[PDB]
Design an enzyme around this catalytic site. Sequence first.
Site, PDB file in Angstrom:
ATOM      1  CG  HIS A   1     -93.245 -38.046-107.578  1.00 32.27           C
ATOM      2  ND1 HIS A   1     -93.380 -36.690-107.820  1.00 32.27           N
ATOM      3  CD2 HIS A   1     -94.489 -38.500-107.293  1.00 32.27           C
ATOM      4  CE1 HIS A   1     -94.647 -36.343-107.677  1.00 32.27           C
ATOM      5  NE2 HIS A   1     -95.341 -37.423-107.353  1.00 32.27           N
TER       6      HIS A   1
ATOM      7  CB  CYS B   1     -97.665 -35.987-104.955  1.00 30.24           C
ATOM      8  SG  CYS B   1     -98.521 -36.488-106.484  1.00 30.24           S
TER       9      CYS B   1
ATOM     10  CD  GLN C   1     -94.955 -29.351-113.863  1.00 24.75           C
ATOM     11  OE1 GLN C   1     -95.670 -29.332-112.857  1.00 24.75           O
ATOM     12  NE2 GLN C   1     -94.072 -28.375-114.152  1.00 24.75           N
TER      13      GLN C   1
ATOM     14  CB  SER D   1     -95.236 -29.761-108.743  1.00 23.34           C
ATOM     15  OG  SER D   1     -95.733 -30.072-110.024  1.00 23.34           O
TER      16      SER D   1
ATOM     17  CG  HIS E   1     -90.647 -33.808-108.522  1.00 18.78           C
ATOM     18  ND1 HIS E   1     -91.930 -34.256-108.761  1.00 18.78           N
ATOM     19  CD2 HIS E   1     -90.625 -32.509-108.903  1.00 18.78           C
ATOM     20  CE1 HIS E   1     -92.658 -33.267-109.247  1.00 18.78           C
ATOM     21  NE2 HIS E   1     -91.891 -32.193-109.341  1.00 18.78           N
TER      22      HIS E   1
HETATM   23  O1  LIG Z   1     -95.228 -33.695-114.374  1.00 19.25           O
HETATM   24  C1  LIG Z   1     -94.433 -34.095-113.271  1.00 19.25           C
HETATM   25  C2  LIG Z   1     -95.303 -34.356-112.076  1.00 19.25           C
HETATM   26  C3  LIG Z   1     -95.844 -35.615-111.847  1.00 19.25           C
HETATM   27  C4  LIG Z   1     -96.694 -35.874-110.770  1.00 19.25           C
HETATM   28  C5  LIG Z   1     -96.938 -34.832-109.924  1.00 19.25           C
HETATM   29  C6  LIG Z   1     -96.398 -33.581-110.133  1.00 19.25           C
HETATM   30  C7  LIG Z   1     -95.596 -33.308-111.203  1.00 19.25           C
HETATM   31  O2  LIG Z   1     -96.824 -32.722-109.143  1.00 19.25           O
HETATM   32  C8  LIG Z   1     -97.369 -33.584-108.143  1.00 19.25           C
HETATM   33  O3  LIG Z   1     -97.726 -34.805-108.794  1.00 19.25           O
HETATM   34  O1  LIG Z   2    -101.416 -37.194-108.324  1.00 16.53           O
HETATM   35  C1  LIG Z   2    -101.332 -38.173-109.344  1.00 16.53           C
HETATM   36  C2  LIG Z   2    -101.656 -39.538-108.802  1.00 16.53           C
HETATM   37  C3  LIG Z   2    -101.251 -40.685-109.475  1.00 16.53           C
HETATM   38  C4  LIG Z   2    -101.530 -41.970-108.998  1.00 16.53           C
HETATM   39  C5  LIG Z   2    -102.229 -42.048-107.832  1.00 16.53           C
HETATM   40  C6  LIG Z   2    -102.635 -40.923-107.153  1.00 16.53           C
HETATM   41  C7  LIG Z   2    -102.354 -39.662-107.600  1.00 16.53           C
HETATM   42  O2  LIG Z   2    -103.300 -41.289-106.006  1.00 16.53           O
HETATM   43  C8  LIG Z   2    -103.543 -42.688-106.167  1.00 16.53           C
HETATM   44  O3  LIG Z   2    -102.624 -43.175-107.146  1.00 16.53           O
END
Ligand SMILES: OCc1ccc2c(c1)OCO2
Ligand SMILES: OCc1ccc2c(c1)OCO2
Length: 147
Positions: free
Chosen positions: A43, A97, A115, A138, A141
């Site tokens: 995302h 993110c 979410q 958040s 997306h």
């Molecule tokens: O639950 C949905 C979601 C997934 C990953 C995220 C997020 C929200 O906010 C930033 O990383």
């Molecule tokens: O925020 C969630 C998240 C998921 C996978 C990831 C990450 C962060 O950073 C390295 O790979």
Amino acid sequence: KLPPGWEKAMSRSSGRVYYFNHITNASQWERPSGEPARVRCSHLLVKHSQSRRPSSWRQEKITRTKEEALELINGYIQKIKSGEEDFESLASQFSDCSSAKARGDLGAFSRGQMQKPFEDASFALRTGEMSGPVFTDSGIHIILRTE
Ligand SMILES: OCc1ccc2c(c1)OCO2
Ligand SMILES: OCc1ccc2c(c1)OCO2
């Protein structure tokens, strides 16, 4: 008649029919094609001032409004759909993110962990398919289902 969440619509500027998905906010000209315990998605998130935590690795204090965030999400979708930019390239440069470091990849997940707008759109994407703007607490997306 059509896959889950799709409906026919009409283009205001052209008068041609197109297809819109009310779960993933995707839209496209051609009639859509054709559930798993897990899905894998990447995302691109753009936060705004009403985000549950209005800060990211890009900005100590995120100040843009919801409307501005939607405008940025909309432009990224334009460049992705025309091929001028790749999704992974934009998620790495501009996603609020920490998964920007992994080109937006989140890994595989099951229902009940994300979410719920995000979750519903992810599981309603077909493999290889991208969403339109999806709203959570958040921010906004763009979702790409990779598995
Ligand atoms: O639950 C949905 C979601 C997934 C990953 C995220 C997020 C929200 O906010 C930033 O990383
Ligand atoms: O925020 C969630 C998240 C998921 C996978 C990831 C990450 C962060 O950073 C390295 O790979």
